[PDB]
Amino acid sequence: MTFEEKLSKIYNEIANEISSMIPVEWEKVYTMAYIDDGGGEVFFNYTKPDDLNYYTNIPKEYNISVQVFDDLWMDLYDLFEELRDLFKEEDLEPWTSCEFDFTREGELKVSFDYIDWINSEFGQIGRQNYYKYRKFGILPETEYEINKVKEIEQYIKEL
């Protein structure tokens, strides 16, 4: 199996997982995974046939138990971590972030970024809010968070 085949297998597994975590019909799906040496996290938003829907709200609104959803969540994270370990296994610079987007109409985008988030000294919420501001046009709901988004913006501009 080549590198492309490994990437493809993992991508397919990821897509199937994320689709399995959504109990209803979805239109667009935006997934983000921040993984470095100091742990990491995975989150995704999904639209319905528009408004973004945050993944951790799925068990609250729909009939899927917290336990099952959290299990599938952990499996997804494990998939992304395996994806990074592949990059390591092929003597490539390990990515620090991965965007995994796909739509109901077959659109697909997988991209990697290598921002040194550790030395940025910003936490997961800052990274998430900044991501939501960059990808979409959504700004946070408190001035503290907004200010942090500006700080991260300026940190990145100075790279």
Author numbering: 1 to 49, 52 to 161
Manuscript excerpt for this entry:
Toxin EsaD secreted by some S. aureus strains through the type VII secretion system (T7SS) specifically kills those strains lacking the antitoxin EsaG. EsaD is a toxin secreted in a T7SS machinery-dependent manner by S. aureus. Here we report the structures of EsaG, the nuclease domain of EsaD and their complex, which together reveal an inhibition mechanism that relies on significant conformational change of the toxin. The major contribution of this study is the discovery of an inhibitory mechanism in the toxin-antitoxin module that is based on a significant structural deformation of the toxin, where the central β-sheet of the nuclease domain of EsaD is split by EsaG into two fragments.
To investigate whether EsaG contains an IDR domain as most of the other type II antitoxins, we determined the crystal structure of full-length EsaG at a resolution of 2.30 Ǻ. There are two EsaG molecules in the asymmetric unit, which interact with each other in a 2-fold symmetry. Even though gel-filtration experiments indicated a dimer state, chemical cross-linking of EsaG using an amine-specific crosslinking reagent EGS (ethylene glycol bis(succinimidyl succinate)) yielded no cross-linked product. Density gradient centrifugation analysis also supported a monomer form. The structure of EsaG contains a principle four-stranded β-sheet sandwiched by αA’, αB’ and αC’ from one side and αD’ and αE’ from the other side. We noticed that, except for three residues (G50–S51 on loopβ2’-αB’ and E162 on the C-terminus), electron densities were observed for all the other residues of EsaG. Similarly, BH3703 is also well structured with only three residues in the C-terminus missing. This suggests the absence of IDRs in EsaG-like antitoxins and, therefore, a distinct toxin inhibition mechanism in Gram-positive bacteria. Except for subtle movements in some loops, no obvious conformational change happens on EsaG upon EsaDc binding, further supporting the absence of IDR in the inhibition process. In contrast, we didn’t observe any disorder-to-order conversion of the antitoxin EsaG in the structures of EsaG and EsaDc-EsaG complex.
